[model samples]
Target: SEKSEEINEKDLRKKSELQGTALGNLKQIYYYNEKAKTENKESHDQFLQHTILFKGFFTYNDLLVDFDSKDIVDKYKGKKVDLYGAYYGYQCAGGTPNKTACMYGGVTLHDNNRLTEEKKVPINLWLDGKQNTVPLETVKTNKKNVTVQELDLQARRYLQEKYNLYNSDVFDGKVQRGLIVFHTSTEPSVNYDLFGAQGQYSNTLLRIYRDNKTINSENMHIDIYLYTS
Candidate 1:
């Protein structure tokens, strides 16, 4: 069931009541169509159409879930503002009566102190992709979540050797419980009206997860769910 909550740009700008924290730093990236690379409505539409036609091309997840440029303020004058997330959605080529546009649920941030509560909160999320450099052991999988174990190894050395990254604080401590949310790769479909849409404008729910944790945790888990129109 969809929540009857309405989101506006002003609400998004307001700080959270929990601790009045900004929703991380907003980072935006725009993909320009070579022929239609202007910061105008027509250019934006053309870019979207290009994304729909070209599969697997990087858009920096610019496709919004009921959002537009007016919703954000331009930092550094009008150069940066849009915030993008992970990629996972279906698009079709040419033009069709039914189309699937990616939609995003507002960002929900949980304080570290509420980690335990978040872990118990039921959400539909699954492991779509993970850092390949890290080794993870799957322990269980079910309709709600997947549990995994992180093997005890010199993980710090491994990450540093393979990726030259060194931040082992989370992995060095006692096995803490954690969770990571992600989406599965989606395939193009002839039937694009799966989420309920007419002709001019339609929106599809893209997969998103709330929890993210390190592998050295005591009980690391994940879940999966779909979006509806």
Candidate 2:
């Protein structure tokens, strides 16, 4: 796609700078193409087989940290299309299973429409632009309250509507294209790890599940970064 045609309306910010860096890195890994086929030719053959994992440009501090993919098994497994996010790896599994990552921040998946009995539903949702704050404050039990069905539809919608609207050119007046789900509180007990340091309420996490065992670097494209001040 032409850079000029691509949406570049966001103000130059630390985050945007990071995104720029991520894009460059993705190019290094694979040729430029937003669709799944461009990244992985196999995806084109399996287009209707299952949800193809599609990657986009995003990064942080010259470090590649994020990408987006929507696969069928994943969607059926309750995965929703979403903007990717993460905390320092320290927040991940620690010395034991006791150590785990917080499930919040970034675009989440949810399907709020209650009318459909079909299990897998509510496709294509995302969160981008400013004013959107995630890792929202909510009871951990809320995760249990919503069944897979609700979480896929109703709960997903709640997250989108409850959160701020994405006013950027990417999703202006349009429903968010990516979706994700969180299992952490927006403002309650929190823990984090960064640069190999552990602390309380320090970082956030977004979980991603891919069914393909051996994925090619071309199959994925990720670019993400963080910013402050």
Candidate 3:
């Protein structure tokens, strides 16, 4: 498929930043395209995958700590997607069973969406240019609670609407994009090993049942970095 003519736009930060003054939510989410594939094409590539860097959790302190994937799966077992995850290693089984509990530096299958879902604890999502906030309800697009996928869609729309942009204007799914979640109300550090496990919360979860394996630095392109500022 042929593509649309590209538009010259403002700086990447101007177009991509999703800010909230009240909760001090600042999502540095931006999309960038990859060289188009000759055999495959997808718009949701940008949707399903993501990267997150801790931008300012130290000061903001609103960022929630990630628990083992087991917590998420157990919480929404039958309600949402069929998903499962957990870190592996001797430490994983030692006590509470996670990096947070045992400082078990192990990997689970790659599904950053779980972390994205963690951010769904409602915040005042601010439109980039306007003073007024964009209702999380408007972006819900449905009556039920929103999923990471839904938020990704509206995030794309918000980018386009704010800048007279297209799907390709602010982002391209071909390459993995990123979002910034602020920091640890649990702990104030990003040195995962030095700080090993963070405060009250511990372990980012994963180990999809379909695969039956622990987290991994597999070829999966989507990456989520939990850091302390």
- Model 3: residues with Cα > 4 Å off, grouped in runs: 1-68, 78-140, 161-229
Deviation from native of the Cα of residue 79 in model 3, angstroms: 5.0
Query: Which ten residues in a row are the worst by lDDT in model 2?
Result: 35-44
Better of 1 and 2 by lDDT: 2
Q: Write down the lDDT of every candidate, Cα atoms only.
A: 0.22, 0.25, 0.23
Instruction: Give the per-residue Cα lDDT of candidate 3 at 132.
Output: 38
lDDT of 3 at 210: 19
On residues 117-221, what C-alpha lDDT tens digit does candidate 2 reach at each position? 322222222234233333422111122112222232233334334432222224432332322322223322111111111222223112221212111111111
Report the alpha-carbon TM-score of model 1 versus the true structure.
0.18
| CA shift of 36, model 3, Å | 21
RMSD of 3: 19.0
Q: Cα deviation in Å at residue 9, candidate 1?
A: 33
Candidate 1 lDDT over 1-229, as tens digits, reads 1111221111221111112111111000011111111111111232331121221222432332222333321111222122222322345222232332343322112122123322322222211122232233222221122211111112212323443222122433221111223212232111111112122111222221111111222243223211211
The backbone clash count of each candidate, in order, is: 10, 34, 12
Worst lDDT 10-window in candidate 3: 39-48
State in Å the error of residue 141, model 2: 21
